[PDB]
Short mmCIF file of C-alpha atoms in Angstrom, two decimals:
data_model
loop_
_atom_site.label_atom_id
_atom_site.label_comp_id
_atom_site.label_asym_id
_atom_site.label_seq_id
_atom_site.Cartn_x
_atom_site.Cartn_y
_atom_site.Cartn_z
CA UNK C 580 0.00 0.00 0.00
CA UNK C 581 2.64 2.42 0.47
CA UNK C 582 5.74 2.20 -2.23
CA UNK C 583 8.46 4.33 0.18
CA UNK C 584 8.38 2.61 3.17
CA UNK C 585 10.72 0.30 4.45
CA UNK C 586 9.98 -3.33 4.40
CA UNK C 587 11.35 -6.08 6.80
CA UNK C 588 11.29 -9.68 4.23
CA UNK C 589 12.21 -12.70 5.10
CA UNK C 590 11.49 -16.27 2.76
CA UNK C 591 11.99 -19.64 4.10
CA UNK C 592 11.19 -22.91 1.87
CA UNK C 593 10.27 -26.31 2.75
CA UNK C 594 10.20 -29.42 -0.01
CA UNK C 595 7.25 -29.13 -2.26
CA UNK C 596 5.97 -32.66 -1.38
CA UNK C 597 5.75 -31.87 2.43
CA UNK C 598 8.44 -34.50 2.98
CA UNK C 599 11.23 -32.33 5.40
CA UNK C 600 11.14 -28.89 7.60
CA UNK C 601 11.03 -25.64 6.87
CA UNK C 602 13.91 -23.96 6.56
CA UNK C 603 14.97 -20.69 8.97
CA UNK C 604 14.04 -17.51 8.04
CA UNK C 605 16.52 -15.55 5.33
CA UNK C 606 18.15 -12.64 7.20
CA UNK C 607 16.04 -9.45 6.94
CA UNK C 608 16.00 -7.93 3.87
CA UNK C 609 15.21 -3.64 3.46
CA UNK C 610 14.27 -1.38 0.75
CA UNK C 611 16.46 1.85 0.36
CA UNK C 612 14.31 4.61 -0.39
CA UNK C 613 14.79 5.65 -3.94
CA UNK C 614 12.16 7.31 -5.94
CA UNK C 615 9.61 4.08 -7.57
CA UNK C 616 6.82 6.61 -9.00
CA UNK C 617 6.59 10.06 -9.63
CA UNK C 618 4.91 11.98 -6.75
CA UNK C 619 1.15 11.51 -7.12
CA UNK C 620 -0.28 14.88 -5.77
CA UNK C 621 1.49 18.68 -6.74
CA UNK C 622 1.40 20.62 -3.39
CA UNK C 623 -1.22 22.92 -2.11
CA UNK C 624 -0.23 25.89 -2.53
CA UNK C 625 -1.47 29.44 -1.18
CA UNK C 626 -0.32 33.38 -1.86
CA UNK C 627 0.58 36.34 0.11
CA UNK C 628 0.18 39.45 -1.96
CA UNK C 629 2.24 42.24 -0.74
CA UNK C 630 0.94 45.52 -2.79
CA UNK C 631 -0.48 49.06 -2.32
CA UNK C 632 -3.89 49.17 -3.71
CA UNK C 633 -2.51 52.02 -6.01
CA UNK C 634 0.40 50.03 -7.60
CA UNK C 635 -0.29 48.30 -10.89
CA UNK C 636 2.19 45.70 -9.73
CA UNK C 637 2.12 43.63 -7.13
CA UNK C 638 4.40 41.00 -5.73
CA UNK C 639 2.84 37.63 -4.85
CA UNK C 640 4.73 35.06 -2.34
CA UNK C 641 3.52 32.07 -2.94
CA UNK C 642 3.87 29.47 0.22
CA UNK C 643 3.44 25.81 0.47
CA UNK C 644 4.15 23.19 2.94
CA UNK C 645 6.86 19.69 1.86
CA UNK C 646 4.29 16.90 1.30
CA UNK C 647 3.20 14.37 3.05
CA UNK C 648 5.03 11.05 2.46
CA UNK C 649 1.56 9.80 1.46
CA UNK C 650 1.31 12.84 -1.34
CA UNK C 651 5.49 12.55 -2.46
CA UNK C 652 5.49 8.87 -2.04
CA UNK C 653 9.08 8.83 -1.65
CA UNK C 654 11.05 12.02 -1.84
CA UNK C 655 11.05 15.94 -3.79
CA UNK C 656 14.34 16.94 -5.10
CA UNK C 657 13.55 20.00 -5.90
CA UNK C 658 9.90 22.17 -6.75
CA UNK C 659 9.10 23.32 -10.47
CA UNK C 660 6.80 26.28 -10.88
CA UNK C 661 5.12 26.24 -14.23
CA UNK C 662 3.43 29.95 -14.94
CA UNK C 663 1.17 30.40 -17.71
CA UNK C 664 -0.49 33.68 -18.82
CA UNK C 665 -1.82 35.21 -21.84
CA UNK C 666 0.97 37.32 -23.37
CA UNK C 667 4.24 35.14 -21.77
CA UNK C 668 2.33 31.61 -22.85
CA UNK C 669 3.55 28.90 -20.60
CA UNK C 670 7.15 29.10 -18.33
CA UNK C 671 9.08 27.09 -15.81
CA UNK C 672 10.83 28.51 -12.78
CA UNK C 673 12.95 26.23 -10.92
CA UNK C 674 12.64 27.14 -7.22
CA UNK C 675 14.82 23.67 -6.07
CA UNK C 676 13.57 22.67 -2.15
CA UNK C 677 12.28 26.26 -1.01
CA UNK C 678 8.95 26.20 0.08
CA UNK C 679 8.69 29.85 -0.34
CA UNK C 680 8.46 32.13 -3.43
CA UNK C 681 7.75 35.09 -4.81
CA UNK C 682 6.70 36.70 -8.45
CA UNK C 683 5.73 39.80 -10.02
CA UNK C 684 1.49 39.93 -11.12
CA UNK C 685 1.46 42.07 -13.70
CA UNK C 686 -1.20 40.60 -16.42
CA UNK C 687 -4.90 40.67 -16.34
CA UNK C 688 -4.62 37.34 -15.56
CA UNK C 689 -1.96 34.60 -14.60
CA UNK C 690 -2.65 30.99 -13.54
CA UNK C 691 0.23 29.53 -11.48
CA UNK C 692 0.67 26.05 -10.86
CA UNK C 693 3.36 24.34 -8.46
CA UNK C 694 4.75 20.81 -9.84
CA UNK C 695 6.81 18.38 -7.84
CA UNK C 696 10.04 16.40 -9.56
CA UNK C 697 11.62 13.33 -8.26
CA UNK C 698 14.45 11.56 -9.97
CA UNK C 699 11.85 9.99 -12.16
CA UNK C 700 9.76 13.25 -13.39
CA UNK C 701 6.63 15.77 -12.38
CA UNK C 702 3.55 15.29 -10.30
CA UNK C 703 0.87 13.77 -12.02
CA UNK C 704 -2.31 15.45 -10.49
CA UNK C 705 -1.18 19.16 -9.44
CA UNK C 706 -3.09 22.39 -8.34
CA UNK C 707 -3.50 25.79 -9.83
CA UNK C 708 -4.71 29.07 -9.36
CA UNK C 709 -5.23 31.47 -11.22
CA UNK C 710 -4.90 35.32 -10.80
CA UNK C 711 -7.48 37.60 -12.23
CA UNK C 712 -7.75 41.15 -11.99
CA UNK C 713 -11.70 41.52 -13.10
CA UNK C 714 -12.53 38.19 -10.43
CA UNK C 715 -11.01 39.71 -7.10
CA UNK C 716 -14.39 41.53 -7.81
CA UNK C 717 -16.84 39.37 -7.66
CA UNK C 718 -18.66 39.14 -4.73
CA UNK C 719 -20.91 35.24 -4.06
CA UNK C 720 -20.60 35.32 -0.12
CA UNK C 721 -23.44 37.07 0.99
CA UNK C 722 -22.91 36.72 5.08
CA UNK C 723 -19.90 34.95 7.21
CA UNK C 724 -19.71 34.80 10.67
CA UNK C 725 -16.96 33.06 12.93
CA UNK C 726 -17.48 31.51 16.50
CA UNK C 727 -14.67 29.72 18.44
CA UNK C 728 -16.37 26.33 19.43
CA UNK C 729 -12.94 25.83 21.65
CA UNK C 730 -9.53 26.08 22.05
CA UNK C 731 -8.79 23.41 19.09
CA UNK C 732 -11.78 24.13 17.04
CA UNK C 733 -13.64 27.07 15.35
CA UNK C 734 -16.61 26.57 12.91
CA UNK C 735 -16.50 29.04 10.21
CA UNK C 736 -19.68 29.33 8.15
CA UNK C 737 -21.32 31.21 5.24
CA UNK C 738 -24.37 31.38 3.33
CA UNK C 739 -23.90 31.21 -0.48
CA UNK C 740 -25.57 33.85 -2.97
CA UNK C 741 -26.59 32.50 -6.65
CA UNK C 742 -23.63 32.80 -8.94
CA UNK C 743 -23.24 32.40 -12.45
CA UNK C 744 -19.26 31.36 -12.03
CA UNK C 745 -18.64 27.81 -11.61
CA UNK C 746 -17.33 27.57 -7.91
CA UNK C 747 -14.81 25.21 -7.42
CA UNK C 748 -14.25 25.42 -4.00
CA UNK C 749 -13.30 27.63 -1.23
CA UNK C 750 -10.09 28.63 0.77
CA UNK C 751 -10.49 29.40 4.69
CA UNK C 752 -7.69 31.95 5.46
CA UNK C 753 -7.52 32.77 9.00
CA UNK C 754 -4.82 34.61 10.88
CA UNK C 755 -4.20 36.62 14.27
CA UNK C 756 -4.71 40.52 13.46
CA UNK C 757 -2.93 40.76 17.38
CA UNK C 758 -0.46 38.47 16.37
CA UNK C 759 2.07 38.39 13.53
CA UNK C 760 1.33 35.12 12.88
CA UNK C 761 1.90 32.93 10.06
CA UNK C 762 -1.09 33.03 7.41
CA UNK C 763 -2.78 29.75 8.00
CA UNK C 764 -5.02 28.01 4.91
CA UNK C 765 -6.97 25.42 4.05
CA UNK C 766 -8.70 23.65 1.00
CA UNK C 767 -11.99 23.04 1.33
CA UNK C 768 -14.82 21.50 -1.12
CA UNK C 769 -17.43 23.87 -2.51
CA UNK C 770 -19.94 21.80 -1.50
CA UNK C 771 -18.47 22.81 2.27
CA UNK C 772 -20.87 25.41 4.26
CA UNK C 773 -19.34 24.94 7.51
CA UNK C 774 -16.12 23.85 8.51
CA UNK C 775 -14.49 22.91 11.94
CA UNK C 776 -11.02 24.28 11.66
CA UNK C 777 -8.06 21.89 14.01
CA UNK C 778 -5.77 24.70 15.42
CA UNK C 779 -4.95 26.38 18.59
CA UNK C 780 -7.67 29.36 19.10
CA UNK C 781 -7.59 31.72 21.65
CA UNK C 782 -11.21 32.89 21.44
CA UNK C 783 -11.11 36.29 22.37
CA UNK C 784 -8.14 37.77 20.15
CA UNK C 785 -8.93 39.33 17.13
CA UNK C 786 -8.71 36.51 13.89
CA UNK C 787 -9.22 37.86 10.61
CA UNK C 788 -11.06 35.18 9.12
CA UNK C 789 -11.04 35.17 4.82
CA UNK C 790 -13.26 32.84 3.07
CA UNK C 791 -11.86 33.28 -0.47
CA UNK C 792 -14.42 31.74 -3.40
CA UNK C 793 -12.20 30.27 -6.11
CA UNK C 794 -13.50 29.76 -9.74
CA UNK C 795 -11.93 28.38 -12.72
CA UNK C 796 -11.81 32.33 -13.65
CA UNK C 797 -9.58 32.91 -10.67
CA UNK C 798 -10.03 34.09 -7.08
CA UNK C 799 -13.22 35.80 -6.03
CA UNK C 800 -13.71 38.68 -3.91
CA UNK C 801 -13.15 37.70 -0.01
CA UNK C 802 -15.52 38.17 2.30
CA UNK C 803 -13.69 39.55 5.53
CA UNK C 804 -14.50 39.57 9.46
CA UNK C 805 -12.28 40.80 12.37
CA UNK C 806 -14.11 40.05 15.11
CA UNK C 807 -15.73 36.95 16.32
CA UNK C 808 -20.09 37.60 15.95
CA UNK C 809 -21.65 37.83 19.48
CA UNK C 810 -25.35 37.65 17.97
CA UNK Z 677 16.39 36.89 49.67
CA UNK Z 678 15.50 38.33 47.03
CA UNK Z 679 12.54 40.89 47.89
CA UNK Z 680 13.79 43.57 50.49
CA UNK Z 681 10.55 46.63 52.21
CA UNK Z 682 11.72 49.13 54.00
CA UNK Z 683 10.58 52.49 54.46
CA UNK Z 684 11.06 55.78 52.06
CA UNK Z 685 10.84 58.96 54.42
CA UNK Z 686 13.09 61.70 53.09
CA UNK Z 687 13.24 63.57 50.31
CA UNK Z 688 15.97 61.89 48.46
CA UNK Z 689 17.04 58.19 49.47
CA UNK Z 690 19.46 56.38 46.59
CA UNK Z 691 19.64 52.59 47.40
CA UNK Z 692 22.32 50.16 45.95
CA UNK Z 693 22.10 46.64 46.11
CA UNK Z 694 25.30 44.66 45.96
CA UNK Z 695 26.37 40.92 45.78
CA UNK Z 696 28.98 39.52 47.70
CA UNK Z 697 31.04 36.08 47.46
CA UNK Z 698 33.46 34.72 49.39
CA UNK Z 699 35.82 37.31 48.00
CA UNK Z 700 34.29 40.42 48.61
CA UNK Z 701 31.47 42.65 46.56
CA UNK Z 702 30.33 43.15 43.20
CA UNK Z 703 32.17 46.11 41.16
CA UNK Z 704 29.18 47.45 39.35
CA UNK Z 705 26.41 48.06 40.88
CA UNK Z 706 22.91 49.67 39.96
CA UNK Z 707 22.05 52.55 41.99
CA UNK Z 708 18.13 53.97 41.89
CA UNK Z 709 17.65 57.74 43.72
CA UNK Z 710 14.02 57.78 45.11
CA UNK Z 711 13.26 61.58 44.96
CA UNK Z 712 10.13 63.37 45.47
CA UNK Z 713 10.41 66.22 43.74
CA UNK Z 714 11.90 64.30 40.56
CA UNK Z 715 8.12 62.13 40.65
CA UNK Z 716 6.49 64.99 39.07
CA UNK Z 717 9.20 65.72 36.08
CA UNK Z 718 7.46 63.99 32.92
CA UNK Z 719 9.30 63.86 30.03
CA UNK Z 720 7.37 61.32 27.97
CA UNK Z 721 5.04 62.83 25.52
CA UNK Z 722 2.60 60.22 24.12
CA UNK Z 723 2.84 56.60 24.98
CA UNK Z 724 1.23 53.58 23.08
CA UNK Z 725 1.12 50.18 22.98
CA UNK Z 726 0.47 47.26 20.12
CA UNK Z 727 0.17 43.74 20.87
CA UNK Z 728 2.74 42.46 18.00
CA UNK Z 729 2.00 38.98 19.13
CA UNK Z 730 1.33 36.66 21.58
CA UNK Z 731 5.14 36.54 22.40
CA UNK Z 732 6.15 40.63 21.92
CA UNK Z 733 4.28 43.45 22.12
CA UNK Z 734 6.11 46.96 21.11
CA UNK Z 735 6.13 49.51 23.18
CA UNK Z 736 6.37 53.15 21.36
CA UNK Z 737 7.68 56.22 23.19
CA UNK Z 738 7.91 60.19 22.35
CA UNK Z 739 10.52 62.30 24.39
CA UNK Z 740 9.81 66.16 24.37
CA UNK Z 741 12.81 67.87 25.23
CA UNK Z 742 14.30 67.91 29.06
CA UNK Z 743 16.90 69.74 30.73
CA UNK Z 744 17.54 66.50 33.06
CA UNK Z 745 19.96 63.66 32.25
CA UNK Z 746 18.09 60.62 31.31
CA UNK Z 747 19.89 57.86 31.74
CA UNK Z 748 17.61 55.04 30.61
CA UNK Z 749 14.26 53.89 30.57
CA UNK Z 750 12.49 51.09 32.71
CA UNK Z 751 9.06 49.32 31.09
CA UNK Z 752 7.07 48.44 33.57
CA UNK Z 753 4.14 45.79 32.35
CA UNK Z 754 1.64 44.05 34.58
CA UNK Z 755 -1.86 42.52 33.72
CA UNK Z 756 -4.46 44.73 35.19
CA UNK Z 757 -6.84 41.53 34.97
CA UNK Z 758 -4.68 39.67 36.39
CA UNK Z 759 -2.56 39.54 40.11
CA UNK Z 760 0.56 38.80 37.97
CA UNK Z 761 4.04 39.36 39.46
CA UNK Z 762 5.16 43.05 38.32
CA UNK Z 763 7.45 42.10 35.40
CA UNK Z 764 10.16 44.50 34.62
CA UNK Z 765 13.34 45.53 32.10
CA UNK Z 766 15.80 47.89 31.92
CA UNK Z 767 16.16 49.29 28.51
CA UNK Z 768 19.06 52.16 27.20
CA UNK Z 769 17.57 55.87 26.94
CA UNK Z 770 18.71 55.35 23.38
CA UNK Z 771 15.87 53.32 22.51
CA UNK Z 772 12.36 54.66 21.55
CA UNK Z 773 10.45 51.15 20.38
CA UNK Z 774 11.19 48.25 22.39
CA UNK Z 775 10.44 44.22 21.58
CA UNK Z 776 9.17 43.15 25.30
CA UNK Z 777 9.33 39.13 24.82
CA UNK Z 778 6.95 37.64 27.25
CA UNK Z 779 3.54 35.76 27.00
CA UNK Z 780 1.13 38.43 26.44
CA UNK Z 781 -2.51 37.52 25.74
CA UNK Z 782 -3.59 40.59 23.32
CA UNK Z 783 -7.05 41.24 24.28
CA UNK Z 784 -6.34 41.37 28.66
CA UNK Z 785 -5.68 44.93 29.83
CA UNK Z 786 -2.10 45.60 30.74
CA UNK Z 787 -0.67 48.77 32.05
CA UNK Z 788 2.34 49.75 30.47
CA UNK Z 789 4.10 52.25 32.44
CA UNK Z 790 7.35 54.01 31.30
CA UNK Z 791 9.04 55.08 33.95
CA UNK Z 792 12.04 57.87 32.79
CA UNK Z 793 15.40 57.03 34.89
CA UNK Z 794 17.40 60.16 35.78
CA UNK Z 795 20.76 60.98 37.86
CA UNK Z 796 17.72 63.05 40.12
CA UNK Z 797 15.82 60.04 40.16
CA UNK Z 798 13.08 58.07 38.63
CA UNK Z 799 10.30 60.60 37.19
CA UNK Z 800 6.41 60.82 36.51
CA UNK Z 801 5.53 57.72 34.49
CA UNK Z 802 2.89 57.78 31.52
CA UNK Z 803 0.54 55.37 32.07
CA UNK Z 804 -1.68 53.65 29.63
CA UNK Z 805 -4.60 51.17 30.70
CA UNK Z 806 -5.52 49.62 26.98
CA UNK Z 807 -3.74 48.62 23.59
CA UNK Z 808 -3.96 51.49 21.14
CA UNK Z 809 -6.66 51.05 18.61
CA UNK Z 810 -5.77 53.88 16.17
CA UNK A 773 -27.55 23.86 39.58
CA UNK A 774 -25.61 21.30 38.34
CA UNK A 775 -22.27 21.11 36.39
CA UNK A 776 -22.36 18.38 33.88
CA UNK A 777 -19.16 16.71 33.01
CA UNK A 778 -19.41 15.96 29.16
CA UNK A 779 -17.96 16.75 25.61
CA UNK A 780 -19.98 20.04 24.72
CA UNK A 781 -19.11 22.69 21.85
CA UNK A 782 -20.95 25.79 23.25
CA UNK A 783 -22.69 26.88 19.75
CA UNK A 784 -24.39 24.07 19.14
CA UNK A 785 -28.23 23.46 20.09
CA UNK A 786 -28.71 21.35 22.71
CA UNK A 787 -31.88 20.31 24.36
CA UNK A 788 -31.56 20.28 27.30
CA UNK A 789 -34.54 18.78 29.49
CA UNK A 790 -35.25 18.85 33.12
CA UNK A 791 -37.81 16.19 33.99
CA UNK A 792 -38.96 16.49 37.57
CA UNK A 793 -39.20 12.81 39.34
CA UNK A 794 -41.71 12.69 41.99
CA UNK A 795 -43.48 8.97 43.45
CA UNK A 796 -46.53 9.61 41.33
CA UNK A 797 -44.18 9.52 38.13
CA UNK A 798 -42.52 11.79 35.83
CA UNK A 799 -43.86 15.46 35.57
CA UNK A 800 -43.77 17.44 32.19
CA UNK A 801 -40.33 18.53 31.33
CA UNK A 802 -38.82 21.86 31.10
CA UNK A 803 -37.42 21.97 27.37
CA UNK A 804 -35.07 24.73 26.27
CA UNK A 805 -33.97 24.00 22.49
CA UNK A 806 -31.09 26.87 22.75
CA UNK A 807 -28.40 28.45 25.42
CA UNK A 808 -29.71 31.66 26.95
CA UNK A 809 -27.77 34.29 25.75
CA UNK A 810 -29.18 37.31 28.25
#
């Protein structure tokens, strides 16, 4: 079941005809990890955009975790980033193992999309997302309210206007706004209205939570709360 | 021990507190003159303070101008919500934002005081009951 | 009053019933379908 873990094997043998014993068990044999598949999942990937709202340009971090062994079977040695835009056409930036980088958004629209390579090639199945200028726009959450359930827990939920943009599905965002703490994200299913979120909350500081629609046409316009609803 | 009370009666009182060994006493010591008069000098214009995190919170300072010596600051930080242990740093009279590292929870009211340190003694702290919301 | 030991996440509706136990049998419940926010 899994192709990058080590297994312990040992054969012993007897005579086919049942006629003797069974012979002592072969000394242990091991795998060495080496890269048997490509990796079967790209990595999810989010983006920091670091911008004034009056700047035609704006510079986009993009930030991932390593996978899972479960997601890179075996090992990454080293992260492809394959842009593709309108004007440009299609590019690859070799970012080896940072998990961390950061490109200029200056089209109408770019989709990005993060591969993994192994010594045998890319990631089969990988995400993108795709940058739009006109989409940051568009508006489909109509209300979103956060409440701490716990310590470990917060549901996060929203109520869904009609759209005529295929939703795909939705990224929660959530962060301290007292704390300068690492943007946290996760991918969630469209079909998703309310979520229970496994981190550690402290219910009364101030979490920006940022339920971001995303389309095929690119990221939709977040709806934003800073402030846990008392109603 | 390491707490000491005793009683502040005249109008200037400097106390030193030194370590000794086996050998003798320490060769630099602090020294802090408890004046009366100096209590109402107040040097420190505005004061503010930002929860950065749940580990540092800046402190922000502006000095108007003073004809007495300061020789450094001391922030002062206790929970006002809580019967925590006055916490305490020294900090150069160079500085005017400061990175306090300690657990602070970001909503609970702390006073911050900045008390300014001079040769006269320690002066009128500004005093500030809630983070800064501006 | 009575502080009940269990797994609860606060938003959640609960119903919460009293029933009052007396020999004759079990009186009508007290049913609250929400936590009292006032």
């Amino acid at each position: 079941p899994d192709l990058c873990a080590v297994y312990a094997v040992q054969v012993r043998c007897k005579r086919l005809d049942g006629l003797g014993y069974w012979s002592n068990w072969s000394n242990p044999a091991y795998t060495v990890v080496m890269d048997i598949k490509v990796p079967m999942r790209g990595p999810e990937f989010w983006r920091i955009i670091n911008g004034d709202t009056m700047k035609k340009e704006k510079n986009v971090t993009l930030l991932w975790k390593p996978l899972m062994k479960n997601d890179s079977l075996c090992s990454v040695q080293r992260y492809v980033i394959n842009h593709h835009t309108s004007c440009n056409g299609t590019w690859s930036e070799d970012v080896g193992n940072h998990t961390k980088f950061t490109f200029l958004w200056t089209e109408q629209a770019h989709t990005v999309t993060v591969l993994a390579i192994n010594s045998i090639g890319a990631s089969v199945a990988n995400f993108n997302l795709t940058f739009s200028w006109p989409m940051s726009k568009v508006n489909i959450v109509q209300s979103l309210s956060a409440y701490p359930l716990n310590s470990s827990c917060v549901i996060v939920s929203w109520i869904l206007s009609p759209s005529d943009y295929k939703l795909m599905y939705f990224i929660i965002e959530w962060k301290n706004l007292n704390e300068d703490g690492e943007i946290k994200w996760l991918r969630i299913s469209s079909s998703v209205k309310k979520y229970y979120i496994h981190d550690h909350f402290i219910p009364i500081e101030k979490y920006q939570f940022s339920l971001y629609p995303i389309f095929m046409e690119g990221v939709g316009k977040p709806k934003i709360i800073n402030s846990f609803t008392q109603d």
